[PDB]
Amino acid sequence: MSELEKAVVALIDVFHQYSGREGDKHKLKKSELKELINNELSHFLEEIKEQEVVDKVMETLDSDGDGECDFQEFMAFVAMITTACHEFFE
Amino acid sequence: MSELEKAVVALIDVFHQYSGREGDKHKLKKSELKELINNELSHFLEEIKEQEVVDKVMETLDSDGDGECDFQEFMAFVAMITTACHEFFE
Ligand SMILES: *[C@H]1c2c(ccc3c2OCO3)-c2ccc3cc4c(cc3c2N1C)OCO4
Ligand SMILES: *[C@H]1c2c(ccc3c2OCO3)-c2ccc3cc4c(cc3c2N1C)OCO4
Ligand SMILES: [Ca+2]
Ligand SMILES: [Ca+2]
Ligand SMILES: [Ca+2]
Ligand SMILES: [Ca+2]
């Protein structure tokens, strides 16, 4: 497999490390999204310590309105937190 | 860095390896998208040998209608072609 295919499989793996913990095993509820951001995105985002901050993050990404982050919405979230990076690649 | 972060950076890096070849350096035109799929996604997708297949993939990815695949749209494309994987992580 290519570097790209290995990165995609790695992305899916970590998403499931969090979505599979509670309730719907294929979506992140707020407590799972909080842990993923704090444990795994520490270079891209500030640690979340307040409930109101997690609420807003979820509200900003939850495009279909079900209260949870599915894989499609997570992938869009990954794109949003990378916006500043592209200029450095060009 | 975390496994997720390394994977995200790898995804951005391969996108730009193709998007930076011609024209808009931050989007994939049809030629760049075909090249990326054929060279980097050969486990997830069949080799593209027909113009109709390229046209259809671009049409399906291109949510803003500019004829090119930007990074957000690429993240959505990655999520689409990996749907069969998820059941292996629960
Ligand atoms: C984006 C970026 C990265 C890490 C953390 C971040 C952001 O935006 C805010 O939080 C990141 C990681 C790695 C690279 C590697 C290379 C880039 C840009 C990167 C970023 N950008 C700065 O350009 C070439 O290699
Ligand atoms: C997703 C899958 C893989 C290769 C080609 C594919 C798909 O779906 C459409 O075409 C793939 C590669 C690697 C892994 C690794 C592990 C998974 C699932 C994978 C897949 N699925 C089947 O679960 C645990 O590790
Ligand atoms: Ca869950
Ligand atoms: Ca949702
Ligand atoms: Ca281009
Ligand atoms: Ca587009």
Side-chain angles (χ1 to χ4, degrees):
Chain A
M1 304 231 295
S2 72
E3 300 306 309
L4 198 204
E5 290 167 313
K6 289 194 277 209
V8 176
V9 173
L11 250 54
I12 300 176
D13 185 14
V14 179
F15 174 85
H16 277 88
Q17 286 167 208
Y18 294 81
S19 70
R21 294 182 175 197
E22 293 173 284
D24 194 320
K25 293 192 127 90
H26 297 254
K27 302 165 195 203
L28 306 161
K29 68 164 91 170
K30 297 165 172 198
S31 66
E32 299 166 333
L33 203 221
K34 186 175 178 190
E35 299 291 1
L36 187 157
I37 284 171
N38 280 353
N39 289 339
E40 315 299 344
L41 294 173
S42 77
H43 289 89
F44 280 85
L45 299 165
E46 280 186 6
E47 204 184 334
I48 294 157
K49 305 187 193 170
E50 307 284 343
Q51 192 54 59
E52 132 226 292
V53 178
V54 208
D55 289 1
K56 178 90 181 168
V57 171
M58 179 68 75
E59 183 180 28
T60 306
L61 59 73
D62 176 29
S63 301
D64 72 355
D66 72 0
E68 303 207 15
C69 187
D70 69 7
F71 192 70
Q72 187 186 347
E73 293 164 341
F74 180 70
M75 283 305 268
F77 182 62
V78 171
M80 185 269 291
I81 70 180
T82 63
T83 300
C85 309
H86 304 287
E87 288 221 35
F88 297 99
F89 282 89
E90 162 183 6
Chain B
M1 76 244 90
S2 79
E3 276 309 304
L4 208 202
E5 288 165 326
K6 284 180 217 188
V8 168
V9 175
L11 274 166
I12 300 159
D13 187 16
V14 182
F15 177 84
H16 278 85
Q17 285 170 208
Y18 288 90
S19 70
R21 289 170 173 198
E22 320 165 63
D24 196 319
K25 305 304 184 294
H26 300 279
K27 302 179 179 53
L28 307 158
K29 51 172 64 187
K30 279 190 212 182
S31 59
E32 288 159 342
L33 198 221
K34 184 193 170 176
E35 277 153 21
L36 185 150
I37 287 163
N38 286 179
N39 288 287
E40 314 302 342
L41 294 174
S42 70
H43 300 85
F44 289 80
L45 291 168
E46 307 191 351
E47 194 187 335
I48 298 156
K49 310 195 196 183
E50 159 60 34
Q51 188 66 48
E52 195 188 7
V53 178
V54 177
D55 294 349
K56 177 67 172 206
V57 173
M58 180 61 78
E59 166 104 295
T60 302
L61 298 192
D62 181 25
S63 306
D64 64 3
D66 70 358
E68 292 201 37
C69 175
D70 69 9
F71 189 67
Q72 189 179 22
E73 290 167 341
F74 176 74
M75 294 296 283
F77 173 58
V78 163
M80 186 268 289
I81 67 189
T82 57
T83 55
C85 296
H86 291 277
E87 83 167 347
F88 286 90
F89 286 100
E90 35 146 356

